[PDB]
Amino acid sequence: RDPLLDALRREGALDFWSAGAYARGVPLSEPPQAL
């Protein structure tokens, strides 16, 4: 980001939702799908 007006809340939270994505091991990077 560059203007960073509100990203620290709304995208800051999304950056740790997407770290597990339904707390399911983020399927597209889970070991059974080999990255």
Side-chain angles (χ1 to χ4, degrees), residues 1-7 9-13 15-35:
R1 281 295 196 170
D2 181 81
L4 222 173
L5 300 178
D6 196 45
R9 303 191 305 135
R10 67 209 298 138
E11 287 156 61
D15 189 68
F16 66 71
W17 171 250
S18 59
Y22 308 104
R24 174 54 187 75
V26 58
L28 60 290
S29 295
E30 203 199 354
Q33 286 76 245
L35 304 172

